[PDB]
Scaffold this active site. Structure first.
Site, PDB file in Angstrom:
ATOM      1  N   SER A  51       0.768  -1.248   0.000  1.00 21.94           N
ATOM      2  CA  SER A  51       0.000   0.000   0.000  1.00 21.94           C
ATOM      3  C   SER A  51       0.802   1.302   0.000  1.00 21.94           C
ATOM      4  O   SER A  51       0.196   2.388  -0.136  1.00 21.94           O
ATOM      5  CB  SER A  51      -0.946   0.036   1.201  1.00 21.94           C
ATOM      6  OG  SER A  51      -1.837  -1.089   1.229  1.00 21.94           O
ATOM      7  N   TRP A 191       1.510  -3.269   3.803  1.00 21.60           N
ATOM      8  CA  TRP A 191       1.510  -4.618   4.392  1.00 21.60           C
ATOM      9  C   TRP A 191       1.325  -5.605   3.268  1.00 21.60           C
ATOM     10  O   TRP A 191       0.212  -5.766   2.752  1.00 21.60           O
ATOM     11  CB  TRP A 191       0.400  -4.751   5.424  1.00 21.60           C
ATOM     12  CG  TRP A 191       0.398  -6.012   6.283  1.00 21.60           C
ATOM     13  CD1 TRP A 191       0.986  -7.232   6.002  1.00 21.60           C
ATOM     14  CD2 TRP A 191      -0.271  -6.177   7.540  1.00 21.60           C
ATOM     15  NE1 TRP A 191       0.732  -8.105   7.020  1.00 21.60           N
ATOM     16  CE2 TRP A 191      -0.047  -7.489   7.965  1.00 21.60           C
ATOM     17  CE3 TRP A 191      -1.048  -5.333   8.342  1.00 21.60           C
ATOM     18  CZ2 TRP A 191      -0.563  -7.984   9.162  1.00 21.60           C
ATOM     19  CZ3 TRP A 191      -1.557  -5.824   9.548  1.00 21.60           C
ATOM     20  CH2 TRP A 191      -1.311  -7.131   9.943  1.00 21.60           C
TER      21      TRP A 191
HETATM   22  C1  LIG Z   1      -1.864  -2.305   1.831  1.00 19.14           C
HETATM   23  O1  LIG Z   1      -0.541  -2.714   1.942  1.00 19.14           O
HETATM   24  N1  LIG Z   1      -2.894  -3.104   2.157  1.00 19.14           N
HETATM   25  C2  LIG Z   1      -4.273  -2.582   2.108  1.00 19.14           C
HETATM   26  C3  LIG Z   1      -4.719  -2.607   3.565  1.00 19.14           C
HETATM   27  N2  LIG Z   1      -4.004  -1.578   4.369  1.00 19.14           N
HETATM   28  O2  LIG Z   1      -2.533  -1.824   4.421  1.00 19.14           O
HETATM   29  S1  LIG Z   1      -1.756  -1.020   5.466  1.00 19.14           S
HETATM   30  O3  LIG Z   1      -2.009  -1.706   6.807  1.00 19.14           O
HETATM   31  O4  LIG Z   1      -0.289  -1.062   5.183  1.00 19.14           O
HETATM   32  O5  LIG Z   1      -2.232   0.424   5.522  1.00 19.14           O
HETATM   33  C4  LIG Z   1      -4.475  -3.890   4.116  1.00 19.14           C
HETATM   34  C5  LIG Z   1      -3.563  -4.830   3.586  1.00 19.14           C
HETATM   35  C6  LIG Z   1      -3.389  -6.041   4.291  1.00 19.14           C
HETATM   36  C7  LIG Z   1      -2.770  -4.568   2.412  1.00 19.14           C
HETATM   37  C8  LIG Z   1      -3.054  -5.389   1.280  1.00 19.14           C
HETATM   38  N3  LIG Z   1      -2.065  -6.084   0.722  1.00 19.14           N
HETATM   39  O6  LIG Z   1      -4.185  -5.369   0.780  1.00 19.14           O
END
Ligand SMILES: *C(=O)N1C[C@H](NOS(=O)(=O)O)C=C(C)[C@H]1C(N)=O
Length: 245
Positions: A51, A191
């Site tokens: 993200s 993440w």
């Molecule tokens: C982004 O890396 N995401 C979308 C969502 N929020 O991520 S964050 O916790 O870093 O802000 C949740 C996720 C698990 C991830 C994803 N790969 O969809």
């Protein structure tokens, strides 16, 4: 200021040790990059941006007139991973909620050809988006190192990316996550859940009362039943320990 370098290093290492993971935080002061944490060799290894890519996705979509900052991206009425995402939102609200569906819609509007040319033009990470316009930042092939992430943050913080000033300012507005004393923290978390091991990111900068900007990128391994907020907690403790906030 009287605190030794040895002590700062040991303190920051201990924050990653206590979370029972492996990670780094890279801090940039002017041109100098400082690598802290408990797994320093992570600094030049490549990971999916996850993200954190929203920052660039936003710059690209705004610069190329694929959206405006006031536009409401409607929820399609389908079930989402988080209830918080089952609503209509702006790019800015979606940045704060890290609502992937909104940013996937934006990527689709941009389209594969333009996305590849723009990612190449900004020289982001390994610059490879492959053939799937809607998940290339989540599961590969796009990768980036923690050094590249902090240098991207540094560029954005100082308006040096090759986008209009206005576009850079619109996106930065979306990234304010915290104010502590006179300092503001602008950052985006990430993440990588669709890769093993999973990667956790918090990339951004501190704007200090005086106007100085100190970019950072935290990068660590997210483990089963780890809370997302550990990324923020380690970051804030590290920045405070170094006297940056
Ligand atoms: C982004 O890396 N995401 C979308 C969502 N929020 O991520 S964050 O916790 O870093 O802000 C949740 C996720 C698990 C991830 C994803 N790969 O969809």
């Amino acid at each position: 200021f009287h605190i030794s370098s040895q002590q700062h290093e040991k303190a920051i290492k201990s924050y990653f040790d206590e979370a029972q993971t492996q990670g780094v935080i890279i801090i940039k002061e002017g041109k100098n990059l400082s690598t802290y944490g408990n797994a320093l060799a992570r600094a030049n290894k490549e990971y999916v941006p996850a993200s954190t890519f929203k920052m660039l996705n936003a710059l690209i979509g705004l610069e190329n007139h694929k959206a405006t900052t006031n536009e409401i991206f409607k929820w399609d009425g389908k079930k989402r991973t988080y209830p918080m995402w089952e609503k209509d939102m702006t790019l800015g609200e979606a940045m704060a909620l890290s609502a992937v569906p909104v940013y996937q819609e934006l990527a689709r509007r941009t389209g594969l050809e333009l996305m590849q040319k723009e990612v190449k033009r900004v020289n982001f990470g390994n610059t490879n988006i492959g053939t799937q316009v809607d998940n290339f930042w989540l599961v590969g092939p796009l990768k980036i190192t923690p050094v590249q992430e902090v240098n991207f943050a540094d560029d954005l913080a100082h308006n040096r990316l090759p986008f209009k000033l206005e576009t850079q300012e619109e996106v930065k507005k979306m990234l304010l996550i915290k104010e502590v004393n006179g300092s503001k923290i602008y950052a985006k978390s990430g993440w990588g859940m669709g890769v093993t091991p999973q990667v956790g990111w918090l990339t951004g900068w501190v704007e200090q009362a005086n106007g100085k900007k100190i970019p950072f990128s935290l990068n660590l391994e997210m483990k089963e039943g780890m809370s997302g907020s550990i990324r923020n907690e380690i970051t804030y403790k590290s920045l405070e320990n170094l006297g940056i906030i």
